[PDB]
Enzyme design. Sequence first.
Site, PDB file in Angstrom:
ATOM      1  N   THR C  49       0.755  -1.094   0.073  1.00  0.00           N
ATOM      2  CA  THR C  49       0.041  -0.210   0.100  1.00  0.00           C
ATOM      3  C   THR C  49       0.909   1.301  -0.083  1.00  0.00           C
ATOM      4  O   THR C  49       0.467   2.098  -0.489  1.00  0.00           O
ATOM      5  CB  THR C  49      -0.893  -0.154   1.259  1.00  0.00           C
ATOM      6  OG1 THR C  49      -1.624  -1.156   1.235  1.00  0.00           O
ATOM      7  CG2 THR C  49      -1.797   1.222   1.322  1.00  0.00           C
ATOM      8  N   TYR C 138       4.616 -12.127   5.265  1.00  0.00           N
ATOM      9  CA  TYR C 138       3.698 -11.347   4.761  1.00  0.00           C
ATOM     10  C   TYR C 138       3.098 -12.076   3.515  1.00  0.00           C
ATOM     11  O   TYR C 138       3.899 -12.418   2.636  1.00  0.00           O
ATOM     12  CB  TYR C 138       4.215  -9.926   4.167  1.00  0.00           C
ATOM     13  CG  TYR C 138       3.016  -9.076   3.481  1.00  0.00           C
ATOM     14  CD1 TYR C 138       1.627  -9.249   2.967  1.00  0.00           C
ATOM     15  CD2 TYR C 138       3.385  -8.097   2.693  1.00  0.00           C
ATOM     16  CE1 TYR C 138       0.794  -8.641   2.549  1.00  0.00           C
ATOM     17  CE2 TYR C 138       2.823  -7.236   1.855  1.00  0.00           C
ATOM     18  CZ  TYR C 138       1.324  -7.455   1.655  1.00  0.00           C
ATOM     19  OH  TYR C 138       0.470  -6.617   0.831  1.00  0.00           O
ATOM     20  N   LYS C 166       0.934 -12.032   8.450  1.00  0.00           N
ATOM     21  CA  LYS C 166       0.280 -11.130   7.760  1.00  0.00           C
ATOM     22  C   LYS C 166      -0.484 -11.822   6.712  1.00  0.00           C
ATOM     23  O   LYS C 166       0.240 -12.426   5.683  1.00  0.00           O
ATOM     24  CB  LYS C 166       0.915  -9.856   6.932  1.00  0.00           C
ATOM     25  CG  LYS C 166      -0.349  -8.791   6.230  1.00  0.00           C
ATOM     26  CD  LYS C 166       0.378  -7.417   5.836  1.00  0.00           C
ATOM     27  CE  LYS C 166      -0.705  -6.806   5.191  1.00  0.00           C
ATOM     28  NZ  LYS C 166       0.002  -5.755   4.350  1.00  0.00           N
ATOM     29  N   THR C 168      -2.673 -12.118   3.842  1.00  0.00           N
ATOM     30  CA  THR C 168      -3.808 -11.623   2.631  1.00  0.00           C
ATOM     31  C   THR C 168      -4.079 -12.604   1.839  1.00  0.00           C
ATOM     32  O   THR C 168      -3.789 -12.711   0.758  1.00  0.00           O
ATOM     33  CB  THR C 168      -2.900 -10.373   2.054  1.00  0.00           C
ATOM     34  OG1 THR C 168      -2.427  -9.313   3.018  1.00  0.00           O
ATOM     35  CG2 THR C 168      -3.818  -9.804   0.903  1.00  0.00           C
ATOM     36  N   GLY C 190      -5.536  -9.538   6.068  1.00  0.00           N
ATOM     37  CA  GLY C 190      -5.071  -8.751   5.012  1.00  0.00           C
ATOM     38  C   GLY C 190      -6.111  -8.078   4.070  1.00  0.00           C
ATOM     39  O   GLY C 190      -5.747  -6.959   3.437  1.00  0.00           O
ATOM     40  N   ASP C 192      -9.143  -6.262   3.863  1.00  0.00           N
ATOM     41  CA  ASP C 192     -10.184  -5.502   4.593  1.00  0.00           C
ATOM     42  C   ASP C 192     -11.776  -5.944   4.288  1.00  0.00           C
ATOM     43  O   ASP C 192     -12.365  -5.817   5.223  1.00  0.00           O
ATOM     44  CB  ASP C 192     -10.219  -3.854   4.103  1.00  0.00           C
ATOM     45  CG  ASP C 192      -8.653  -3.370   4.345  1.00  0.00           C
ATOM     46  OD1 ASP C 192      -7.833  -4.064   4.646  1.00  0.00           O
ATOM     47  OD2 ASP C 192      -8.434  -2.002   4.321  1.00  0.00           O
TER      48      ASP C 192
END
Lengths: 297, 297, 297, 297
Positions: C49, C138, C166, C168, C190, C192
């Site tokens: 991001t 991640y 993390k 996602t 991860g 939203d």
Amino acid sequence: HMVSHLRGVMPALLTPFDAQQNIDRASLRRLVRFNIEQGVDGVYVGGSTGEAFVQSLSEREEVLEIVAEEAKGKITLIAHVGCVSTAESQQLAAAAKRYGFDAVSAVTPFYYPFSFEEHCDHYRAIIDSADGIPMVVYNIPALSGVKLTLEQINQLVTLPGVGALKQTSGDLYQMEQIRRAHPELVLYNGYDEIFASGLLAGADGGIGSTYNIMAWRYLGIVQALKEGDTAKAQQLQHECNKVIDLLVKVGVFRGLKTVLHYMDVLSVPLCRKPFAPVEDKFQAELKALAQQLMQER
Amino acid sequence: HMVSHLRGVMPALLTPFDAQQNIDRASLRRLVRFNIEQGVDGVYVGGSTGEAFVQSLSEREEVLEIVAEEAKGKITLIAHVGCVSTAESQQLAAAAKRYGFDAVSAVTPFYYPFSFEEHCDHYRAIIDSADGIPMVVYNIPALSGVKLTLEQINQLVTLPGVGALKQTSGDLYQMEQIRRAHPELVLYNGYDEIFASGLLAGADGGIGSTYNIMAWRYLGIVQALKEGDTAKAQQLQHECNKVIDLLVKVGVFRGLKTVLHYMDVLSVPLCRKPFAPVEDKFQAELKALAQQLMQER
Amino acid sequence: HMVSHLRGVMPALLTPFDAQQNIDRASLRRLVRFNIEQGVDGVYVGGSTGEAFVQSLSEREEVLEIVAEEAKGKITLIAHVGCVSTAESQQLAAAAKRYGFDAVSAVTPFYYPFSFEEHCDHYRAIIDSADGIPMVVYNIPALSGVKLTLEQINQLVTLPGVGALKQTSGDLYQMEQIRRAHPELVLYNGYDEIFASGLLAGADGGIGSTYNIMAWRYLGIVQALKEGDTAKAQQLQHECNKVIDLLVKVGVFRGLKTVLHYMDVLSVPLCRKPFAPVEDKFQAELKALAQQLMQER
Amino acid sequence: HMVSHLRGVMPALLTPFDAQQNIDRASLRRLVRFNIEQGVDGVYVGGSTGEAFVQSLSEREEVLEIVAEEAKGKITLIAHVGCVSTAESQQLAAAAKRYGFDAVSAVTPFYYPFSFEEHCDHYRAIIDSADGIPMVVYNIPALSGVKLTLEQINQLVTLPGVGALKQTSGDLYQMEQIRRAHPELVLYNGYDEIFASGLLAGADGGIGSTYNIMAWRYLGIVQALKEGDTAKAQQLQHECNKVIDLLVKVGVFRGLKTVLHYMDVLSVPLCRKPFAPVEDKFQAELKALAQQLMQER
Ligand SMILES: [Cl-]
Ligand SMILES: [Cl-]
Ligand SMILES: [Cl-]
Ligand SMILES: [Cl-]
Ligand SMILES: [Cl-]
Ligand SMILES: [Cl-]
Ligand code: NA
Ligand code: NA
Ligand code: NA
Ligand code: NA
């Protein structure tokens, strides 16, 4: 080696339907005769292209027996007997044997995930029911969802009773690897749109839906590569792909059946639902193509 | 048409590193000279194979300038300037121009999803910074994650300033469609393992990592297909793929660098981390391959 | 267990750029302060991001040091140091340590295929350079192209020095399996758009780009599920996804930066090329959203 | 709204076979009775889990009629009538109507690619033959290969005669989007392993294969989320997924049938070929699970 008689160029036969979606037996017999007179090496009956998976077992058997009546002894006959069910596939294999087919074939069983050992036992059972005619493994990952490794393909093509592989894959590295591992294997190219390149990579023949309307072009690619006429093979493939572009736009099976109707081969060009009919706006192009192909002969 | 001088067989240059993962400038110069003496048509610098994406901009510029010093005027020089960032790509394109490259190239920007119009504007910006040398679009969907349609490819290759397409795709239907739509386009086959089939489908050259160790085989495939020697092109591709099978097992870039080290071209065969070194158990095979390739010349 | 201080809700910080695509340091400091005053548990700096992959190493270090100056000691600070290169990642990890970060994080290295053991050694090297602050693995398969198995995830999260994952991924079966195998693991949701469902499946926090504009909603989902207010968590997620729908339409990072500009947080809402600016037709909706969110506080 | 009587928790009924792979009618009737006595809201007959695609039409009709004889008027009855063929699906829909089913359902037709308009006309034809009982669209992209967009789902669920969607997808962003667009839609979660999270995302019920052996756990998750007992829903899902982990290892349908055999529900736990029998090494675990589940009641 002892199944070299299976090598060559064979249309994946379409199944003609009448106006009410029933099998059109008269047009089926004429389509078989038409393909014989194109000089093909064999016919592949009841495959994907034959709309097998929107037909019952008894309908598939009916088609197998009709085609054998027209074609046994004149050209090689291969029966695609594959279903998801092993027992259903065995029924069709035993029928193909009764009718005098030269080989059977089965798509890797789909929808449900099966282990590789379950795939192998499925082929073994069908081979047993085929009662001595060889098996063609049929690999079409794009549609089956089955993603076999090279090593798995190697095990399938060395199962007792397997005499060929129908390779409907665009991965021509794998095509070459298969040929290098199995120098005598009968190896059919399955995507018509890469036929010349697939032969160059190691295929020694092909099974294809578009062979129903222009087999002489694919036979001509075989000849050109054998003769060393690179440019002629490329120009033939070029012309094939102009046709395939159009068939993909209009819908392949129904476009093929429509061209055949305009060649006076099929009385009615319908596919079974849920395939829709051809859109009216495409008819002129399809009729012009039929006219072009008849003149080119 | 006016960029026909870009057609041909060009190795995707490896970037030699020393024992501490710094650029090995002496071995880089020797690798350029080695490729020139293989009779290649050009060299492709700073691409995927060059480990561009584990190098800084200044390191990539350093490599571009060294290669131009050894090779400008002797063979075609293509600079892969692509980064995710447009501004970084522009910096490398302006440098390539300063150093006298004949063309630039850029992979479709990756990791983040970009719209097709964002891709086009990225190429337009790089073309502007290239200041009059042509652009090679580089398509490698397996690694970039970018899945362009035929119509999108058609728009990219007709952008002002684009002179070629590097097609690292195994879809040889699309290769033929591109050739049929763009009869004069410089069209590089990107997967070495299908080179002969890719040429037959419409490519008129290739850019490849394995050309660094056996370019004469790929030049020989070009010649064989031009001469109409189908079997010779197949046997050359057969031998190439025996080598590619081994390189895939050991790791392609490091296997290539190891073969080159055993050919006395590179002093140190390391890739940058996170690539691991070659496993000891593969060294004998790689040294035997180097010996085989040197004898075959 | 001893890294429980890492659990919670942390925005993935955007990197503000000025009108010429240079870092906007004043707006970066204001964005950090804005996120602190939203009551977040931490900030995640230099991630996807944050547009890390269109920035140089020195630019990423600059951002890390600025954020630490504003935020060290007030909220948890996590530095995303991941690059494809292990040595580049190590440089950023050593910098994060110097600046006083509480943890580092690294995306699985992408573009080139690496073996699982190469991935593990990459994390081990970064952990060493982090010099005693814990590592967040991640996982973002949609963008990295890296498709780890559950068993591979289990090995990564038990590497010495790893304190969190993390995740996602939208696979909430795997989220539950990870939680069941690692009851004390810090586990960040991860995506939203599934935050409430991801917490229910086992995540105990989240790292997210949209937290920059509405962190109180995600904090409110945490609270609602802790309190047993099922309906309130659903209505909060409902409102979050109305916003995410809009951000996906306009482009997520630039839409977030535009909302923040209309909240008077960022002076200039641009992303770096090849991201295009926001289309004019979306500005009214984005300004209305900013007004709505400010009123809702 | 007027089909709210379809909401709830319904097992996807397994089809019991005897030792020779014929339908075991006595065990089928006992399985229906067992599911009724678990307190389920309905039963879903002849679906994927029912091994529909290794059965003939007449076998599927036989199962539909038997289940209606045991269950009409006691619980909701949904008939999965989907085949690739529209005409075959219509035959099963007309039969389901004759037997008194409350709804029909059809998987998106698979194997052959069909256009979205062909999918819609397929559902329209089946709805007509269902003669006034509502249709459940069944979405299972992992197995069907059909990848519908949100906008396409929106059009399907608003076709006249459609009363529900069976959403066998792990994308809980899309689940929430569907719920937000269709606040009254009956929306079944299809992946048992994310049931609690799927309800939270917007599903208001579920259709699932594992409900055959532990429906009270899924009913308990519904109740827990309604009551606001977050932790209880998580612990129930935790225990469900311990069971699903085991079923995935042993093979899901045959593992379920084996547990049911050890619960004295089914006389013979076989699936049809090409499914293999359960490996002997798993029997102890499956029998222990049956014992555990019976004690837990
Ligand atoms: Cl069938
Ligand atoms: Cl089927
Ligand atoms: Cl770079
Ligand atoms: Cl990068
Ligand atoms: Cl970076
Ligand atoms: Cl069926
Ligand atoms: Na023959
Ligand atoms: Na040249
Ligand atoms: Na904190
Ligand atoms: Na009910």
